[PDB]
Symmetry: C3
Subunit: 337 residues, 3 copies
Amino acid sequence: AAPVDISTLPRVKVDLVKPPFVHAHDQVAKTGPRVVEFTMTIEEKKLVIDREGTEIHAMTFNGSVPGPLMVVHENDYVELRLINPDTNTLLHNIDFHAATGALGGGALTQVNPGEETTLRFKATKPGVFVYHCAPEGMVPWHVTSGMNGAIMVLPRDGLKDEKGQPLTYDKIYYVGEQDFYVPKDEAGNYKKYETPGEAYEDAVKAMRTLTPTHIVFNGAVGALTGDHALTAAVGERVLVVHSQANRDTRPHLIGGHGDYVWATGKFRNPPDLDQETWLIPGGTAGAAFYTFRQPGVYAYVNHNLIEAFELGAAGHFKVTGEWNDDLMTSVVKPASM
Amino acid sequence: AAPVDISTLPRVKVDLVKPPFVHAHDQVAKTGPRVVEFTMTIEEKKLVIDREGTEIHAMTFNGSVPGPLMVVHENDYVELRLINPDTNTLLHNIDFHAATGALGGGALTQVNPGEETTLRFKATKPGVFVYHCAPEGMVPWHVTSGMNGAIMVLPRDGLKDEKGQPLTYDKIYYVGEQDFYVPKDEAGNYKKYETPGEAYEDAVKAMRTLTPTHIVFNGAVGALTGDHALTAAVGERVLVVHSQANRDTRPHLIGGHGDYVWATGKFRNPPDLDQETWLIPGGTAGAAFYTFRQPGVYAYVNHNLIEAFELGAAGHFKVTGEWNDDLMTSVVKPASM
Amino acid sequence: AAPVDISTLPRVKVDLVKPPFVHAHDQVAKTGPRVVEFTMTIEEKKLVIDREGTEIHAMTFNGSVPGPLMVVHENDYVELRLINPDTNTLLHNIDFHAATGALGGGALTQVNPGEETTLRFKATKPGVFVYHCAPEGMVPWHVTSGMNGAIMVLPRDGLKDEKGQPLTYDKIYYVGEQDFYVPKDEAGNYKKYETPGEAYEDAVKAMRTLTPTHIVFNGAVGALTGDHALTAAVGERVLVVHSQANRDTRPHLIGGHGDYVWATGKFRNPPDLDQETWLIPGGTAGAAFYTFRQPGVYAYVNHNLIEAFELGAAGHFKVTGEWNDDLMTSVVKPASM
Ligand SMILES: O=N[O-]
Ligand SMILES: O=N[O-]
Ligand SMILES: O=N[O-]
Ligand SMILES: [Cu+2]
Ligand SMILES: [Cu+2]
Ligand SMILES: [Cu+2]
Ligand SMILES: [Cu+2]
Ligand SMILES: [Cu+2]
Ligand SMILES: [Cu+2]
């Protein structure tokens, strides 16, 4: 039996958006299988990651930490043009956990500054998956410099609950959680470096402590707060895709739940119901579906609360609508007696 | 459609017990939905947490670390009177992971010393859940000072196995596992502090190491041993609820199993069978059901064995009854030859 | 009702093999229940664990880290003769997480140098399980010196998928992952020690940091690479059993998946499908089944990539067969433009 002639399939070009937003897509596939075309441009850039002003040299897909969320359906082909402009200094590549073969693509996509490449793979398994740079011999340095994102491979008939009934989200957000290892001197202050090569050994030393200096959502402390808080309305169904390319996390919606959670991200499995908190292992993307029931502020965190509130792994939702006093009320407001 | 008039519902007052014991309750609900009334009094107090005599300033619900286990059924209302006496010095509140809205209750329950408040919420999801103090801006300090416990929301028809058959426990225990971060000087000795404000920065520094100094059950090294070992008889069905409000744990019954385990604690999901060890993520309560088959001593641990046997995360069961040589026997006792 | 007379049952002697290989066995039981006889000889020995030449004093079952994989079926009896030769210096024992009673066997198997013992237990629960030494008062020291392995208790009708259909592996490998805590001086160099007693306090100090110095597969950095890479052919079904007796891990096949994964190792549960990465809690064995679809090199890692590529937790597969360009292809090889 001969393979399909891939040139006979539809091609659709996706235009990516910056996290936590997600490029519009259809949950249930409205066409047959397609070759879904993506382009990303690698950008090495300085980023300020905390309120103190700590500035690092980040390594990004498309200018953001995390890289953007890509969305396809099961048995589509993903065709990525990966560009490493000559304004960068390092070698990069890309590994898709969604893909099969060649170290997820990394063995086929090594691009020096001034080079580009195009990789195609068939997205044979539904789920959310990490993608990340992984140059042989310097893999964790690139990943923990921010060079990771995620791809969602939807079932062609959309998401389903534990009984096989549909689950349809109204909104989707992508939270990439990044552990950074900013090198410290003996007194505990961050060091700064003149070139990437001069940074490398202390970057390795800092990583080998296994103790992040910062753990952030969307690339910085506070990034998903204030004017950039996530939003929803009461009654809205929201999917939050959450990735961590290098270290475990334990997401939690403060004031809510994960009504349906694929903690390790793979949609052929029935979701776990009614979660308070769930474990997304390092190297994984997970997804949680929730229908909001109360308005107000929520905090969405890694529930190692030190990691959340001291190291950065906390964002907010601002939710609009009516308050339900049956679900919760202050019977007696705080008072002296 | 109008809401139910909650004043028409039965009220029942619960009288809490100190962990690891659990206030008597009925597994299968013997009434319709009720407003279940609880009272807890916050107590800041010194606690000796290890064999060396290390003394910390703990922040407790009801005088214990962990706070007591509360038990209700799905779609009961929990009505908690939370009292912060004027003998305390700090601001406190309470967040229930079982609840929906207002940061689990924390936004509605801020009490200064000399204040009290009453919160009501509907327990809409079955499972075991963490509760903890969470004052904005100093959340992990309160949690990791011991200010956390758990609530069990039973299905109205009790627990069920993976096939839908009942599971009925004979005994229940609540193991709260606490990570403490006692500040250390450069030589490695614990520091002591004159006031909570003078402690705060080094408490933050110590937490940011992400390395607990102590990890204990029921508030101290050895608390669940000796005259306070857990007990059972051969053939008894025991549910062990285990919470960790801030850091992952991996419980294990040495010499036994978790016959049915809800590792992330939520009873609408079928349990995992025959577990040796299970991962309870930080910010979660889990529950394990076991039928004892052999007498003797067991050790119940976090199976990072350093955490268990060096840092404190180990308790014991003393089990009474007949020894089964079919299940295990010494064929040849240790000997020279 | 009287117990079975165990002397009426067949006895079969197993001859163990060194990891990552596994002693031949039948997936589906070809006999009724048997007493399966194993012998292991404890060996304390020096091991070089990294490329730098760091040499530790390891504590082994049968000369290897990990100890060999034992394989039986559900409701067989395991009868282990455990020998501690007089050439060793320490007390040892064995705890099987598969067993019920007497701290998994440890209370019955304490052997001084020059002693042996024989333990029997009934393997009543199917799954992969850790076994490890656990001498009272010095448990984590022995475990983290390498004194751990695993046992697989197969269902009598072999493995099944989430729908109850058979899963049959063609190849099985056992990856034991070991966290070592080599004591460091203040400058960060490893210390060496003249006797085990002189090592003990700093071993304890090093363990209490909770920061491994090395995390390795099969006892050393690079052990499962080069001439000792794992092998498969395209189309082959491979089961990888993975244990970690003391600390969480998150395995990942780089370029592949876990098609069916029992992350916490217990076969009465349906497997998780299509995993990218899975969490094996410390104190647990897990198992992943994969059918290879592409040839070439794969890296099998703990996907804390620092742990993998800096601390040692990485091995390789070399896979033989045809490349499938439908599944993945380089459309445009890296080039300037
Ligand atoms: O109650 N959430 O931190
Ligand atoms: O065998 N339990 O540590
Ligand atoms: O893409 N695996 O590191
Ligand atoms: Cu890169
Ligand atoms: Cu990866
Ligand atoms: Cu408090
Ligand atoms: Cu919380
Ligand atoms: Cu030993
Ligand atoms: Cu153990």
